[PDB]
Amino acid sequence: AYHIDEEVGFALPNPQENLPDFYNDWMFIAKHLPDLIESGQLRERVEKLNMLSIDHLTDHKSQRLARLVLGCITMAYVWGKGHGDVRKVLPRNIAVPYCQLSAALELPPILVYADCVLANWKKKDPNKPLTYENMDVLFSFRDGDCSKGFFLVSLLVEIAAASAIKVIPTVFKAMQMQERDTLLKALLEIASCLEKALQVFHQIHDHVNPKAFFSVLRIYLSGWKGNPQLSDGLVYEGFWEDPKEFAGGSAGQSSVFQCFDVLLGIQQTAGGGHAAQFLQDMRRYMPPAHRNFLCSLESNPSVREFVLSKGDAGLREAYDACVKALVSLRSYHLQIVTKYILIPASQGGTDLMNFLKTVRSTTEKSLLKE
Numbered sequence: 001a002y003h004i005d006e007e008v009g010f011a012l013p014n015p016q017e018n019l020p021d022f023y024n025d026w027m028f029i030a031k032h033l034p035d036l037i038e039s040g041q042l043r044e045r046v047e048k049l050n051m052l053s054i055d056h057l058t059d060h061k062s063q064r065l066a067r068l069v070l071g072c073i074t075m076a077y078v079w080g081k082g083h084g085d086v087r088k089v090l091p092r093n094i095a096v097p098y099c100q101l102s103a104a105l106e107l108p109p110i111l112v113y114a115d116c117v118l119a120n121w122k123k124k125d126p127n128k129p130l131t132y133e134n135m136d137v138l139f140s141f142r143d144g145d146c147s148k149g150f151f152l153v154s155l156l157v158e159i160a161a162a163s164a165i166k167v168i169p170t171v172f173k174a175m176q177m178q179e180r181d182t183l184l185k186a187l188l189e190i191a192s193c194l195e196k197a198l199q200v201f202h203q204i205h206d207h208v209n210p211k212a213f214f215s216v217l218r219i220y221l222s223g224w225k226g227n228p229q230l231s232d233g234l235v236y237e238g239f240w241e242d243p244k245e246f247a248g249g250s251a252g253q254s255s256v257f258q259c260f261d262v263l264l265g266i267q268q269t270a271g272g273g274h275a276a277q278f279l280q281d282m283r284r285y286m287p288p289a290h291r292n293f294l295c296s297l298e299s300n301p302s303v304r305e306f307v308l309s310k311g312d313a314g315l316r317e318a319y320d321a322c323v324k325a326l327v328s329l330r331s332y333h334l335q336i337v338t339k340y341i342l343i344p345a346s347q348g349g350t351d352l353m354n355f356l357k358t359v360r361s362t363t364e365k366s367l368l369k370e
């Protein structure tokens with residue numbers, strides 16, 4: 001189908017953690033980024049790799065892991081240590097397989113949300129549940145970067161939203177088959193799961209430290225689109241002749257908030273303003289199956305139209321509980337961007353907050369009763 005798992009939602013079910021032995025020189029660099037970066041051997045070990053054919057990768061999970069491996073190497077190669085000493089050219093022996101692999105997975109050749117979160121995890125013990133304490137990340141950039149906390153908490157917000165996403169078939173079939181009671185329970189279960197996803201979101205304080213995120217990790221997730229340090233983008237040597245620009249990572253790339261915008265008929269990506277264009281641009285950084293899923297929902301009959309047309313105050317309350325849990329998520333998110341970015345910035349990015357406030361505002365405008 002749309003590669004949406006019932007238990008983990010948009011996340012890659014049970015990611016592969018090991019590559020064929022043919023790729024150990026890739027794997028060795030990725031597993032050792034904190035040391036190799038700290039000493040300054042990282043760029044040297046990248047520039048000495050042979051060119052490895054990607055054709056020994058033979059399933060979606062092996063290719064997803066290879067993309068995560070090459071994507072971490074690329075960020076560590078471009079940004080190095082984080083203090084302005086960048087590289088504007090990606091060596092051929094990594095750029096070519098990376099770009100080839102990315103074309104096959106239909107992703108931009110830059111680290112995205114779906115690599116470093118949705119494929120970058122493992123259970124400690126496969127027979128115990130998906131709790132923080134039973135999980136680990138597969139790669140990190142620097143000692144102290146809080147990558148495990150940041151990646152795993154984002155992942156756990158995705159798994160919470162999965163119990164909501166599981167209900168979306170029920171919504172459209174209760175509409176088609178005119179089943180009012182069924183549609184009302186469905187919307188109320190969605191709001192319930194959206195409310196639990198927000199409480200899982202509070203665990204970002206438990207595991208991520210603002211100074212670590214702002215001054216270490218944020219750097220390795222940054223991109224080269226409208227970035228003054230790489231004003232023309234990145235040359236992917238041996239693959240494209242001219243430098244290319246791509247945006248850095250963001251859970252704007254998470255389909256979960258865009259999922260429920262489309263479902264509830266909230267008019268985010270409709271218009272020509274800068275908030276709509278960004279949200280549609282971020283859809284090019286999502287896995288193709290998830291891109292197609294969001295478009296498939298966009299073409300179905302409106303859930304908002306249905307509830308608005310049937311003079312049914314219980315239905316309207318259920319829809320509003322959904323819009324409200326969405327508004328709560330984005331407001332808490334505003335808070336998070338204040339604690340983890342704006343405050344540490346002071347120790348131009350005011351278009352950041354104007355974007356997020358416009359999206360939250362548009363969301364709360366869809367409420368049926370103020």
Ligand code: HEM
Binds near residue numbers: 336
């Ligand atoms: C330290 C933690 C986080 C920070 C600092 C942060 C920051 C940001 C920033 C700066 C943007 C603007 C997009 C851009 O300029 O690239 C953004 C957008 C977004 N973020 Fe986060 N984020 C964090 C965690 C999360 C988590 C855990 C989620 C949900 C799983 C999330 C969901 C979203 C979404 C959906 C958008 C797009 C705007 C919208 O749909 O309302 N973020 N975030």
Ligand SMILES: NS(=O)(=O)NCCNc1nonc1/C(=N/O)Nc1ccc(F)c(Br)c1
Binds near residue numbers: 151221341
């Ligand atoms: N250079 S900048 O302004 O600070 N970049 C801001 C873009 N937002 C983010 N930066 O860093 N994580 C971001 C973000 N926002 O929702 N979510 C986020 C969460 C987990 C991930 F693995 C990735 Br990749 C992105």
